[PDB]
Amino acid sequence: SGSLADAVFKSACEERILLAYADYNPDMTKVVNLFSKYNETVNTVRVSNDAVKDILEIVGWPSMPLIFVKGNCCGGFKELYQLEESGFLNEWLKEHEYDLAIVGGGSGGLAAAKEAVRLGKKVVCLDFVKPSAMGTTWGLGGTCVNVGCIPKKLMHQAALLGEYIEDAKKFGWEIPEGAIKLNWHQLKNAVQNHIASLNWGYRVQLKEKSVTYMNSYATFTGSHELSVKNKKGKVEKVTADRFLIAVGLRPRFPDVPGALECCISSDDLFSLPYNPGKTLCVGASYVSLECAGFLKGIGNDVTVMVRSVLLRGFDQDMAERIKKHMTERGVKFVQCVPIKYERLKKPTDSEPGMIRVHTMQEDEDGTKEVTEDFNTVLMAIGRDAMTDDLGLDVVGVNRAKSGKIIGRREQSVSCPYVYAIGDVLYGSPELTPVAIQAGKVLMRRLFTGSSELTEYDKIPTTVFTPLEYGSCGLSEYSAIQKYGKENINVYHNVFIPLEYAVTERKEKTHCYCKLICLKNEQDLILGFHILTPNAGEITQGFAIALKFDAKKADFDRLIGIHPTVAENFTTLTLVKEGCXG
Amino acid sequence: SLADAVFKSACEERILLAYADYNPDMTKVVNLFSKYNETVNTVRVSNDAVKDILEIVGWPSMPLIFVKGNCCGGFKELYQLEESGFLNEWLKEHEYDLAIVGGGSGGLAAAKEAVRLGKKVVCLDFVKPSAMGTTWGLGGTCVNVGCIPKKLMHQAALLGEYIEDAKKFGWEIPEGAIKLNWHQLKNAVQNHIASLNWGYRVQLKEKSVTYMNSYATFTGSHELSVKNKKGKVEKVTADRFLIAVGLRPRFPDVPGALECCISSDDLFSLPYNPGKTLCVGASYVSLECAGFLKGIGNDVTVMVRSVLLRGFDQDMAERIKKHMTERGVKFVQCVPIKYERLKKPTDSEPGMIRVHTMQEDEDGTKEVTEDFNTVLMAIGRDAMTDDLGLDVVGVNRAKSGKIIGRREQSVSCPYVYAIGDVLYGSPELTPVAIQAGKVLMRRLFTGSSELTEYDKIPTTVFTPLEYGSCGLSEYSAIQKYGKENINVYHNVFIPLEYAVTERKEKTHCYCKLICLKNEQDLILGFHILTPNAGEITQGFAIALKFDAKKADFDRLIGIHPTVAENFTTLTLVKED
Ligand SMILES: Cc1cc2nc3c(=O)[nH]c(=O)nc-3n(C[C@H](O)[C@H](O)[C@H](O)COP(=O)(O)OP(=O)(O)OC[C@H]3O[C@@H](n4cnc5c(N)ncnc54)[C@H](O)[C@@H]3O)c2cc1C
Ligand SMILES: Cc1cc2nc3c(=O)[nH]c(=O)nc-3n(C[C@H](O)[C@H](O)[C@H](O)COP(=O)(O)OP(=O)(O)OC[C@H]3O[C@@H](n4cnc5c(N)ncnc54)[C@H](O)[C@@H]3O)c2cc1C
Ligand SMILES: [Cl-]
Ligand SMILES: [Cl-]
Ligand SMILES: [Cl-]
Ligand code: NA
Ligand code: NA
């Protein structure tokens, strides 16, 4: 009674024009008639009836029949006729310079580039770094490599190593008596040397695999045409049968006087030629807290200014516990939003400047304008998609209010040969390994015709605060909101990592884990949360439990490794709030 | 009717006979029990339930008899118990519901769980001193002379390497050599142990467990004789016994061994820096101890018969050897033939031992000596069960001194159970001892079918670079399924924490995933050489409880940046 999904998508990938049809074929000639206009031959497949629902779910279209052009699902006749009518289909059916043009040389872009090339495709990768307002710019590899996960983790490690020196003394290492300072210049140089090695590793990796790299900023000027502008101002034209947008985000600045003149962002922090000194971190994002955390850990006076709550979107119980701990470690939290930044001093080549930060502070007997002076202000309120100058209007790629591209999965909802992955895809969790997986999987779908989907649910994270926060699945609140207080079991414990047992570390009273369970479905695990050293290393493997609908009973029959923090997930009995014969 | 209903009844009733159809001599049971004014309860088991119930209790055929919630077998085994007088003494009231011989990982965990289920329990614990005179408090091997002190000294070693990283991340540490003071480390470790000793001793009182610091021996069918430090002998009776007595370090039949060589029982309370150290043996204990002693700046030699880590993946063992060699540990394939004491330890200084070896040169074989401050005898661990009176209760032991189980029930005595290192075939790990204890207590006093899972147990060897594993070695998988049906996926990686350093570890971190090719790359085992191997291995180990495939590892989204995410992006196949 027909053929199946894999056979359909293989044909779809192999053939120039494929019509996939079910029970009936009204307008088959209208399609064949429409393509005959461009001397194109239309291939056919009768799909098995008990396979259609699966095929439709995968491509994200409501009903049959389906039309593919050069291995891209277009929809039905309605969508094809729109493409023909606009002249886009005429230009689409032409030969183009590249099988795929990738706009962005970051996590997703590079991963997609390597995977497309492994599948024997001609690919162009475009990457350009518009400087920050402070003038800061960098090499290939994107946010993660240059101004994100990598530099952040290295400075976090600089901070942990500070706490490790004190433990070393308590385990009996005879460290001479002096106060011990962190030299910012050595740290920043060590970080920038590593980044430099990655910049060059990716640049080489692209050459070794015959990916055409262009250090040019790309904009759509045709249906199948990017105009790309290099550093010196040279403008070239690049054509492709398909486009992938993996452009990412840049730090958000608020509409406040001085913000842009006075406040660095994460784009600037990791190549600062000076110790940032007394620092104000503005915002409640994980970036704000991670940066506040390590700056404290390397000995700076650190303040964090937040609108209301920390880590909006994370479990607020865990957020509060991070707040308690970072407060005990000497970070100062104030609930205020600056109304003006005034530059008192400019940075020299080796010393920080000075900014006067203005706030409206509340008495009981009235309201006061208040100022406080900081060496450095880090604007860390969020990250925005900077897609206004991409010419997505020219290719008719629908965007959300926020500037992100709206997907039918990774396919532009409105344009079948433009795809988006990574931070710029509306609703995509903003993580490197998601950008990487989305890229690699998309490239296998497009050029192999496989049914593999990226799994965007139950993604584990770690917030690399001074005491790390690992999580996967629902917050306690989301579980209770969705299923009812009455149907949720929360199993939890405190614990002292054995490494801390011999020390008088503040961490000894803050390590906590909890497991959130659906009571009415055998304590199905909905989420887990842990506050510990090495939270990332613990959370990663436990996260696979959610792919198999793991129950509490599965955590309980898993034998621990002793002595570790991780084994704590194995012996939870405490709930948060005899043969009787 | 069904299994849960059978085992509930079995736990609730004094004497229960479980049957299928019209079993032969169900009368001669009721007749036998009528002798002791006992009522024999009955249950007709559903046919669809029998094979399940028999698998659980570990008996071949169906007419089953329970006594005080203990599965005895069939009429044959009951008659044996009656004939020996044991059944008569069993049906009497006794002082305790359960007597536990051993105050270690298993014993204490069983004690806490029995008491939570409302039972009167006595826990017996005594520590016979080492040959060097060393002794310690409650909590067993792990607390006093095992996992806990070992991991703390391992961390002392790691913190040594962390000081050097601190300089490369820009911490201005005053210049010149930094020494580890052994006395501060040993005191810090012993202070922690002291807190655990006391925590367990209090924990037992708080829960009304009777603790007796006495060494126990069976002198009746249902009677232990227990001897305290001062030499006082008391008698303890119970309706059931749990043996959770553990092991002690093995010494070889070699002149001087016992006089000259410390064991792990002595190492963690040594009143001196051990100095130039010889570690004898290939066990994880030998290598872990060799590793940290090197990490705190000692001249360390390891002497092995042939291979390291017998039982572990030899590819990973070789990689551990290469790394520890690069970190300055000296490996020689020699077995000492004599130890001669040159000096006794005195005044917080180590002694000196002359170690004799047969080495061959271009002419033949010659006796050779080398001098060490300290020799750690770490060849293995044996069950010291000769003096337990297991002959009196008729608890069968294996050649090695371990108790032979029908699961955790003595194969030969239905009211005696064993868990932990002393149960024949039980992996020798704390969390196994703990789970076996807790689960057994729920079986015995709740009548649940819950079994401890003894397969696919994750471990970590806390060598200077940690080795984490779960499931088959490459070799076991190839031996069992054929090289043609095994995919080995692997990678090297540099922990980001090392990227900025000149560490030796940067060339030794490796992971591999062992897959059954003919069953969609079903994961049979995984192995990783990395910092925090324990923390990474624990959660990945749950994948094997669900018959995880490579595809499950591939659709799991990594946490960046971590070592663990490496299990998410393996593409390279090891070819051989
Ligand atoms: C401070 C910080 C810390 C982070 N920490 C973590 C973490 O610990 N773990 C984690 O998983 N994630 C972390 N992230 C997020 C992670 O970096 C992002 O999710 C990921 O980098 C997004 O990758 P991408 O490929 O989608 O975009 P990007 O990596 O940003 O790459 C987009 C690239 O395209 C370039 N580009 C933009 N427009 C154009 C154009 N028109 N033409 C050509 N090129 C263009 C951009 O300049 C950039 O080079 C962090 C982010 C930040 C800012
Ligand atoms: C150096 C070393 C490192 C280890 N590292 C690890 C590790 O990292 N992870 C891990 O999981 N496992 C580790 N182990 C193993 C772990 O210690 C054991 O597996 C575990 O302690 C076994 O617990 P148990 O209850 O079986 O026995 P034990 O903990 O040995 O308890 C037995 C107790 O019973 C006492 N006893 C003996 N006979 C009698 C008697 N007749 N009457 C009364 N009391 C008696 C003993 O003296 C002792 O007090 C390590 C072991 C060693 C030696
Ligand atoms: Cl780190
Ligand atoms: Cl924290
Ligand atoms: Cl530590
Ligand atoms: Na025990
Ligand atoms: Na004791």
Author numbering:
A (entry chain B): 10 to 586, 595 to 598
B (entry chain A): 12 to 587
Task: Quote what the paper states about this structure.
We also solved the crystal structure of BmTrxR, being the first crystallographic structure of a TrxR from a nematode, which, surprisingly, is a fusion of a large TrxR domain with a Grx-like domain at the N-terminus lacking a typical Grx active site motif. Helminth TrxRs are members of the high molecular weight TrxR subfamily and are selenocysteine (Sec, U)-containing homodimeric flavoenzymes. They transfer reducing equivalents from NADPH to their flavin adenine dinucleotide (FAD) cofactor and, subsequently, to a pair of cysteines located at the si-face of the isoalloxazine ring. From there, electrons are transferred to the mobile Sec-containing C-terminal redox center of the symmetrical subunit, that, upon reduction of its Cys-Sec motif, reaches the solvent-exposed surface of the enzyme transferring electrons to the incoming oxidized Trx.
Expressing isoform D of BmTrxR, containing the shortest N-terminal extension with respect to the TrxR and Grx domains that are identical in all three isoforms and utilizing a more recent method for Sec insertion capable of yielding 95–100% of the wild-type form, resulted in a protein producing crystals diffracting up to ∼2.5 Å in C212121 space group. Protein dimerization takes place through the TrxR domain, while the Grx domains lie in the upper external arms of the “W”. There are 3 protein subunits in the asymmetric unit of the crystal lattice; 2 of the 3 subunits, subunit a and b, belong to a physiological dimer while the third, subunit c, forms a physiological dimer with a symmetry-related subunit belonging to an adjacent unit cell. The last four residues (-GCUG) of subunit b have been detected in the X-ray derived electron density because they are trapped between subunit a and subunit c belonging to an adjacent unit cell by a disulfide bridge (2.05 Å) between C596(b)-C22(a) and a selenenylsulfide bond (2.1 Å) between U597(b)-C22(c), respectively. Three cysteines are found in this domain, C22, C82 and C83. While the last two residues are buried, C22 is exposed toward the TrxR domain, about 30 Å apart from the last visible residue of the C-terminus of the TrxR domain of the parent subunit [C22a(CA) - E586b(CA) = 29 Å]. C22 is likely to be a low pKa Cys; it localizes just at the top of an α-helix belonging to the TrxR domain of the same subunit making polar interactions with the carbonyls of F456 and L455 at the top of this helix (the sulfur atom is at 3.4 Å and 3.8 Å from the two oxygens, respectively) and it is within 6.0 Å of the positively charged nitrogens of Arg251 and Lys130 side chains.
